[PDB]
Amino acid sequence: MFINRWLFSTNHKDIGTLYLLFGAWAGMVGTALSLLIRAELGQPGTLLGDDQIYNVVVTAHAFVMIFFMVMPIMIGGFGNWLVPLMIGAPDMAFPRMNNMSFWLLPPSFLLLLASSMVEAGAGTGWTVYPPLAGNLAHAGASVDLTIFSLHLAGVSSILGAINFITTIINMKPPAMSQYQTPLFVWSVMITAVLLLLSLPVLAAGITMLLTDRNLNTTFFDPAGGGDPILYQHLFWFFGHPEVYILILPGFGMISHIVTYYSGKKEPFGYMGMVWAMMSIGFLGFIVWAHHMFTVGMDVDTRAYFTSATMIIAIPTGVKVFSWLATLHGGNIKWSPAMMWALGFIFLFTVGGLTGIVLANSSLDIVLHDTYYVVAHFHYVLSMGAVFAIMGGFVHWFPLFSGYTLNDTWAKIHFAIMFVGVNMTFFPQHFLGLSGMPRRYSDYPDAYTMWNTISSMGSFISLTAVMLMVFIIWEAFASKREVLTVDLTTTNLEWLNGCPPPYHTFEEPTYVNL
Template identity: 55%
Template sequence: SEVYNYLITNHGIAMIFFFLMPVLIGGFGNYLLPLFLLLENLLLPRLNSLSLWIMFPSLCYMELSLYGGAGIGWTFYPPLSLVNTVGSGVDYLMFSLHLAGMSSLVGSINFITTIISSIDFKTSVIIWSYLFTSILLLLSLPVLAAGITMILFDRNFGTAFFEPAGGGDPVLFQHLFWFFGHPEVYVLILPGFGIVSHICMSLSNNNSSFGYYGLLCAMASILVLGSVVWAHHMFMVGLDAKTAIFFSSVTMIIGIPTGIK
C-alpha cells in the first residue's frame, strides 16, 4: 500500500540530487569552466574526482531505501519521518543525502577556488553564475545536513529535536529544510540563466545591450535575497504577523533581480 509513496519520494530525490545537480552544475560546470577560463583542468582535480565517486555509494543507499521503505516525500517532514515510519528505508535515505550533499560541497569548493583564481570583470556571465551557485550551495547544504542528522538521532538514539512528546518542534525542521530548499531553486536555475545570458550576448555581439554589470548585480542580489526568503514556504505553520510580512516583502523584492536576469 506504500509503494506509491516510496516511488514518489525516490523520484523527487533522484531528480534533484542525482540528475539536475550533477548535470547542470557538475557536468556543464566541468565542461564550461576550463573552456571560458582558458584552463586545462579545474584547480583541484582530485576533489573533482572525489565529488564524482561519492555519488555512486549515495545512489546505492537511495536504492536501498526503496527496499527498506521510505514513503516520506522529498521534504521528509517529521513526525512522518520519525517514529511513524517503520523500517530502515528512511535511515538509508538520510545516508544517501549526506553523501550527495558532501559531493556537492566538495564540487562547490573546487569551483569557487578555480573561479576566484582566474576570474576578472570581463569573464562570461556563465562563470559568474557558477560562482554564485557554488556559494549558495556552500551556505545552504550544511544546514540541510544538520536537519537530517537530527532526524537520524531522533529515530535511532532517543533524542527529541523534532518530537513534540519530548519537547521538540517539527517546525524547526521545516526552517532547516527550507533554508536549504529555497536557495536550491536558485542553485538549479542560475547556471541556466548564465547560459541563456551568454547566448544572448554572443548573438547580439554587444555586451552592453543586455547590461553585463546589471546581470552580475542581479545574480549577486539573488544570492543575498535568496538566502532570506525560505519561510514563504511555511505560511501555513502559524508564523507571527511580523515574520510573515518580512518574508512576503523579501519575496516580492527578489522578483526584481530575477526579472532582470
C-alpha cells in the first residue's frame, strides 16, 4: 500500500506533498552551502581553500536553491496541490506523467551531489561558462554530471509545464472562462509557458557544451571557429525567463494571501494583474543580453537591451500598486502569512529597483560581476521568492495537513528571518558600489566590515531555518485539528475541508451561464 501510494502515485495532492518534502530537504542543502560561503567571507583570509572549493560551494548553492528548492516548492508543490482544487478539477490532465516529473528530481539531485564528490567539483558558477567549464580547465566528470543534472531537471519541468498548461486550459468547469480563474492559476499557466519555451534552449546549449567536452565539437572553442559568447546567449535566452519562472508563482501566492488577510473577496484590478503577468512573461524573452553588457556587444544593441529591460517596471508596478490597493480598506488580519506577504511587497520592490539600476548598460559596466548584482538578486530571491514560499506555506499548511501552526512561533520565525536576510544583503550594495567582485574566496582588507556584518546576518537566517523545522515539528506533535476557515466563498481550495479527501471533485462543481 505504501509503495503504491508514494512511489506509484497518480494523485495531485500526494505528488504536491512529495514536491514540498523534496524542496524542504533541498532548502537545508542550499542553506548549508550559503553558510559555507559566508563562513569563508566572514573574516579576511582563506578558511576552506582556494577559489575552486569555494566556487564549487557557490555553484552548488545556486543550483540547489533554484532547481531543487524554489521550482519544486512553487510549481511542483503549491502548483500540484492548489491548481486542480482552484478549478474544481479531479486531478491533473496527465496524472501518471506528473509522477515522473517528481521522480526525475531525486536523480537530478544525485547527479549534482556526484559532480561535487568526483575530481575537484564543478567550480564554474551556475552559468557554467566555457572555456572554464570546458574539458581543459575542468577536465573530468564534474561538469558532465552537472550538465546531466540540468538535463533531468529540464525534462521534469518541460513535462510539468505541458501538464499544467493542458490542465488549466482543458479541465476548468465548462462555464468558467480563463478570466474566471484565480490569479495563482494564471501565474502557474504563464510560468509553464516560460518553462516550455526557455528550457529547450538551455538543453540545446548545455548539450553543445557536452559535445565540446566529449565529442570534439567546437561550438564554443575559437580554435574550431566557435565562440564562448554563443554559449552565453543560449544560457541567458533561458536564464532571464528562468528568473520570471522563479517569481511568477510567488506573485500568484502573494495576490491570494493579500486578498485573504485583507478580508477581501477579490484582488484589486484582476484583469490588470493578468495583463501584468502576461506582459512580464513576454518582455522576459527579449532582454537576456542585460547579462552580457561587458562582453563587447555593439552600442545600439546595448541601447536596445537597456530600454527593453526597463519596460518590465511598468507591468511590475501595476502589480505592486494593485497589492497596495487590495490592502486599502481591508479588515487586516496580522497573520504570519500576511507578514511574509507585506515583507515581500517592500523587499521585492527594493530588489526590482536595484535591477532597474543594473538595466543601465553604462552603469552596469561598473556594477557587473560585483556584489551589487548579488544584492539585487538576493532581495528578489531570498526576500521575494522565499517570502512568497514562507507566506504560502504558513497560509496553506492547515489545508495540506489538517493541523494548525503556532501563530506566535510563526511570527517569531518571520521576525528573525526578516532581520537576518536584511543584515546579510543590505551591506552587499556597499561592497558592490565600492568594487568587490563576485565569486571571490577573499577580498582586499577595505571590504572587511561589510563582509563581517553580512556573514553575521547569514547566521541569524540559519537560526530562523532551524526554528522553522521546530515549528513544523510542534504542529504535527500537538495535532490541533482545523475547524472553520473564513472566506471559502472566494477560496475554493478550502471548501473540501482540511485535509481534503484523496479524491475531490469526483462530482464536478455546478456553474451555470
